[PDB]
Each structure stands twice: as C-alpha cells, then as structure tokens.
Amino acid sequence: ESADLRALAKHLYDSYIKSFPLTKAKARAILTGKKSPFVIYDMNSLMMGEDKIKFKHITPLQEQSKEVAIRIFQGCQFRSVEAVQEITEYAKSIPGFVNLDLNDQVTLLKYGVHEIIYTMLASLMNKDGVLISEGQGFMTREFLKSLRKPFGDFMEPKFEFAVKFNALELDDSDLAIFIAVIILSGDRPGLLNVKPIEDIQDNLLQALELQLKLNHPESSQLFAKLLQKMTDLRQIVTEHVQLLQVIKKTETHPLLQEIY
Amino acid sequence: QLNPESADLRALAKHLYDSYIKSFPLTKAKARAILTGKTTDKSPFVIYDMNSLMMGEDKIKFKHITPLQEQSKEVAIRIFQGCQFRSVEAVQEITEYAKSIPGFVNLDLNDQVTLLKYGVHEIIYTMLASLMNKDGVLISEGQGFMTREFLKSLRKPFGDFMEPKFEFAVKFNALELDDSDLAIFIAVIILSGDRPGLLNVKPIEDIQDNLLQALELQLKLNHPESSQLFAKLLQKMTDLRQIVTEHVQLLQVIKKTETDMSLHPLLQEIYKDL
Numbered sequence: 001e002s003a004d005l006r007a008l009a010k011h012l013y014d015s016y017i018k019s020f021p022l023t024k025a026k027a028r029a030i031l032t033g034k035k036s037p038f039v040i041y042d043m044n045s046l047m048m049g050e051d052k053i054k055f056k057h058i059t060p061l062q063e064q065s066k067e068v069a070i071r072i073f074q075g076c077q078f079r080s081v082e083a084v085q086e087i088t089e090y091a092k093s094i095p096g097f098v099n100l101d102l103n104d105q106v107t108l109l110k111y112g113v114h115e116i117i118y119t120m121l122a123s124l125m126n127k128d129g130v131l132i133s134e135g136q137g138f139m140t141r142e143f144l145k146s147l148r149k150p151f152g153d154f155m156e157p158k159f160e161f162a163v164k165f166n167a168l169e170l171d172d173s174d175l176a177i178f179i180a181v182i183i184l185s186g187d188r189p190g191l192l193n194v195k196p197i198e199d200i201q202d203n204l205l206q207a208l209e210l211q212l213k214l215n216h217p218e219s220s221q222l223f224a225k226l227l228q229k230m231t232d233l234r235q236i237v238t239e240h241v242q243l244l245q246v247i248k249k250t251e252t253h254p255l256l257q258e259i260y
Numbered sequence: 261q262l263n264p265e266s267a268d269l270r271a272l273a274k275h276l277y278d279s280y281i282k283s284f285p286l287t288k289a290k291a292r293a294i295l296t297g298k299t300t301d302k303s304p305f306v307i308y309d310m311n312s313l314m315m316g317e318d319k320i321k322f323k324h325i326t327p328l329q330e331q332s333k334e335v336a337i338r339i340f341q342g343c344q345f346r347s348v349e350a351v352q353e354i355t356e357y358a359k360s361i362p363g364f365v366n367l368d369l370n371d372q373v374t375l376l377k378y379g380v381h382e383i384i385y386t387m388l389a390s391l392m393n394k395d396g397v398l399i400s401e402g403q404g405f406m407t408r409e410f411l412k413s414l415r416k417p418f419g420d421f422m423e424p425k426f427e428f429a430v431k432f433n434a435l436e437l438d439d440s441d442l443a444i445f446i447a448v449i450i451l452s453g454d455r456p457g458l459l460n461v462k463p464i465e466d467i468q469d470n471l472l473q474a475l476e477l478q479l480k481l482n483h484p485e486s487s488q489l490f491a492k493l494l495q496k497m498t499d500l501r502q503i504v505t506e507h508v509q510l511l512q513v514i515k516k517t518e519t520d521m522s523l524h525p526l527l528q529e530i531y532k533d534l
C-alpha cells in the first residue's frame with residue numbers, strides 16, 4: 001500500500017505543478033531574494049506599477065472607482081476568480097473526484113476554494129509583503145495596512161495566518177496533498193453522497209501522513225499540526241465573508257459584477 | 261511492537277485517563293449506560309414539557325442546579341440559569357483536570373489562565389456530546405433527561421441555544437470515542453499554544469506534541485479498524501471553534517434582550533475579550 005500512497009502523492013504534485021503557475025518554491029526564491037519584482041510600498045509606487053507594468057488585472061478597465069483602496073480591493077477579486085479556475089482544474093485531477101455526483105463536485109469547490117486560496121496565498125507571503133501578478137510585483141504589508149476605511153484590515157488577517165502557517169515549512173509536494181484534503185471535505189453543507197467523499201479524503205490523509213513523515217522526519221506531529229491549521233483557515237474565511245458583507249456599505253460593470 | 265518510546269506514551273495515556281475519572285463525576289461510559297436505558301436502577305426522569313419540568317423538580321431533585329431564584333417566573337430563564345451553573349461547575353472540573361496534565365502547572369501563570377480561558381468551552385462541548393443522543397441530553401448528573409424538542413421550543417432567544425450542540429454531538433458521537441480516548445483529546449485541546457495572548461508558546465507546543473503522540477497511539481490501539489480516526493478527530497476541533505463563536509454571539513443578544521438576568525462572573529470573565 002505504501003507504494004500506492006507514494007504514487008498518489010507524486011500524481012498530485014505533478015498535477016499541482018501543471019495547474020498552478022507560481023509555485024511556493026519559485027515564490028520563496030523571489031521573496032528571499034535568492035530580476036527583482038516591482039515593489040509597491042506607497043501610492044506613487046502603485047501608480048508606476050500599473051503604468052510601467054500594466055498589471056493584468058482590473059486597473060485597465062474604465063468606470064471603476066479610480067480610488068486606490070477600492071481598486072486594490074477589486075484587483076484581489078479579479079485574481080481570486082482566476083485562482084478559482086486553477087483550483088478547479090487541479091481538483092479534477094484528484095483520483096475519484098470527477099466520479100462524484102456532479103452537484104457534490106460543485107458543492108465541494110464552492111465551499112473549498114476560499115480555504116485553498118488563503119492556503120496558497122501564504123506561499124506568496126512573508127511577514128513583510130505579498131507577491132502579486134505572477135510574482136512580477138511585491139505589495140508591501142504596510143502599504144496594504146495603510147488603506148482607509150475597512151480596506152486597511154482586509155489583508156492583515158491573511159498575513160497573520162501566513163506567518164504561522166509558513167512556520168510549518170511545507171513545500172509544494174506537501175501542499176499538493178493538503179489542498180486535495182481540503183477539497184474532499186465531507187462536512188460541506190448540501191452534499192448528497194458524503195461516503196465517497198470521506199473515502200477519498202481518507203486515502204488523501206493517508207498519503208499526506210506518509211508524505212510528511214518521509215519529507216520531514218524531524219518535524220514530530222507535523223501531520224497533526226497541519227490539520228489543526230484548518231481551524232485557522234475557516235476562521236479567516238468566515239471573517240472574510242463578514243468584511244465582504246460590510247463592504248456593501250460603501251458601494252464599491254454589470255457584466256463584470258456578474259463575473260465576479 | 262512495544263518499546264521504551266511507545267511505553268512512555270501508554271503510561272501517559274493511563275495517567276490522563278486515571279485523572280479524568282477522578283475529575284469528572286459523569287463519564288461517557290456511565291452516560292451511555294443510562295441513555296441506552298439498559299438497567300432499571302439508572303432510569304432518568306424525562307422532561308419533555310412544562311408539566312414534566314414541574315414534576316421533575318420533585319423526582320430528579322435539583323440541589324439548586326438553577327441559581328436560588330425560587331420561582332424565577334420563566335421556564336426559559338430557569339433552564340438557562342441552570343445551564344450556567346452547570347457550566348461553572350464544569351469549568352471547575354476541567355480546571356482540576358488540567359492541573360494533572362504533566363507540565364501544565366509548570367508553565368507561566370498567565371499562560372495557564374489563557375489556556376483555560378480559551379480551552380474550557382471547547383472541552384465542555386466535547387464532553388457534553390457524551391451526555392447527548394439525537395433526542396436529548398442528560399441533566400442533574402444523569403438523574404434527568406431533557407428532550408431536544410423541549411429545549412428547541414423554549415423562546416426566541418433561548419430556543420436556539422442547544423440545537424448547535426446537538427448537531428455537533430450527533431456527528432462527534434459517530435466517532436464512538438470512549439473515555440480513555442477523550443481524556444487525551446481534552447488534554448490536547450487545553451495545551452494549544454495557538455491561543456491569543458500566549459507568552460511562551462514553545463513549552464506549550466512541546467507538551468502538546470507529546471500529547472498528540474499519546475492520542476495517536478491510543479486511537480490506533482483502541483480503534484484498530486477505524487482508519488484515520490486521529491485526523492478525523494482533530495478536524496472536529498474546528499467544529500468546536502464554530503460552536504463557541506456562535507454561542508458567544510447568542511450571549512451578546514441575551515445580554516441586551518434580558519437586562520434583568522444575571523450572568524455568572526466566572527463565565528463573564530472567560531468570554532471577556534475572547
């Protein structure tokens with residue numbers, strides 16, 4: 001069976017590499033400084049970042065808000081929607097996932113993408129900032145935290161999580177299995193056939209356990225610690241939805257709003 | 261097979277179970293015995309409505325399980341004040357249990373308080389599942405049984421307090437853990453280290469790691485054929501967090517809607533800036 005677990009782990013890694021452009025290994029090389037990314041540390045930096053390197057985001061569109069805080073918040077949305085498709089492609093590569101009731105596949109993705117988005121966003125963050133637009137840029141943590149109204153605190157919670165999550169020192173091969181475990185959560189509301197879902201997650205967990213023991217022999221109970229982080233993830237997610245709610249108190253296209 | 265390493269983990273498991281039995285008067289084993297209505301000496305009086313409640317005070321005498329307020333003129337309030345007193349008593353039991361966790365009393369005094377402050381309700385909900393089945397919950401140390409529907413029809417504010425507990429319990433109980441398992445799981449909850457405001461996270465994480473090791477072996481030896489029970493159990497910890505958060509919000513509403521109802525100081529201190 002150990003062979004089958006290593007096969008699964010390898011398969012997930014390969015798929016993870018193909019589905020996600022910017023890996024943690026790549027992101028870390030850039031973050032530690034081991035072509036420097038454009039650093040957005042203030043307002044003028046931003047404006048030059050958009051101009052000197054048209055960030056493939058919302059910035060191009062007219063009739064927006066031309067208000068930095070609002071445009072930054074919306075760029076986060078554009079990228080999130082983009083990430084959702086990468087996550088979806090990856091999910092279909094998970095053994096058994098496609099064979100699940102189609103409604104359940106949609107339910108799992110619906111409730112799983114936010115947890116995965118923040119998990120992976122941690123790979124692109126350090127206590128000082130976050131990598132943006134395929135790593136071409138680095139947006140300062142301080143800059144983000146200096147945004148007015150409720151925008152100054154929308155990213156901070158992700159940073160706090162990232163700092164702690166990153167302490168586990170997971171690599172892409174570990175993350176590939178962890179992400180799949182998140183997707184196959186049988187406790188998502190509205191599921192029609194929980195059994196198959198838990199059966200797959202059980203096999204994924206077994207693979208994750210072996211992966212962490214072979215990959216980090218020195219880290220006692222790393223498996224247990226990683227699973228505990230699920231608590232942190234869901235907290236950051238619900239917390240995110242709440243701010244997202246309060247946002248409907250600022251009033252920050254129709255087809256665009258439909259898309260995002 | 262057996263080695264000095266796993267031997268130490270088994271000794272710790274035994275210690276924790278022993279201490280658990282000494283700290284908690286109503287174990288899951290006793291709870292299930294009463295619930296499975298097996299015997300004729302352990303039969304609880306069932307409170308499923310007002311009249312039953314009225315007569316319950318007679319049969320399953322409540323040594324003021326509900327704060328001395330005589331006829332508090334309100335079922336919802338009396339029941340509520342009743343669960344408050346029980347919670348305080350449970351906090352006392354858990355506190356006694358915590359001191360038995362190797363290394364716990366050796367940690368910084370402030371962290372000791374922090375760990376109890378954030379771990380207490382999570383443990384209470386975990387153990388409360390031992391006293392529940394899909395139809396109700398044992399009360400007054402097992403002498404009584406209050407139905408889920410009765411509690412569910414209390415009143416706008418209160419009628420919603422227990423449902424989330426029951427929902428959790430039905431799923432958690434599906435794991436079929438026994439007291440020896442829970443003693444370690446509860447110890448793991450207490451020694452988190454990821455609690456807000458901890459001064460020295462390191463020593464705490466070292467203790468928890470050893471407890472997680474103890475829990476892992478325990479589950480595999482006690483539940484041979486229950487694949488990934490360990491991981492499924494740890495995932496339940498997020499369910500507990502949810503319950504607590506939701507319960508806190510309910511309390512805020514009660515605080516404002518019932519300005520004439522006192523809330524226990526101990527509990528108030530625990531929820532403060534939580």
Ligand SMILES: *C(/C=C\C/C=C\C/C=C\CCCC(=O)O)=C\C(=O)CCCCC
Nearest residue numbers: 075076079080083117120121131132133
């Ligand atoms: C926006 C919110 C989520 C990012 C979505 C997925 C995370 C994984 C990779 C993308 C990160 C790179 C990037 O941020 O573009 C978070 C923000 O930092 C807002 C900035 C707006 C994006 C340029």
Ligand SMILES: *C(/C=C\C/C=C\C/C=C\CCCC(=O)O)=C\C(=O)CCCCC
Nearest residue numbers: 284286326339342343346350387388399
């Ligand atoms: C209160 C309702 C629910 C119980 C609340 C908390 C559970 C705490 C401890 C359980 C023990 C678990 C263990 O140690 O195994 C119900 C009442 O008590 C009110 C009714 C009183 C009648 C007026």
Ligand SMILES: COc1ccc2[nH]cc(CC(=O)O)c2c1
Nearest residue numbers: 340341343344347384421507527
């Ligand atoms: C229903 O009344 C209450 C009031 C305050 C409380 N604090 C802790 C609990 C335990 C639980 O949630 O069962 C509780 C119950």
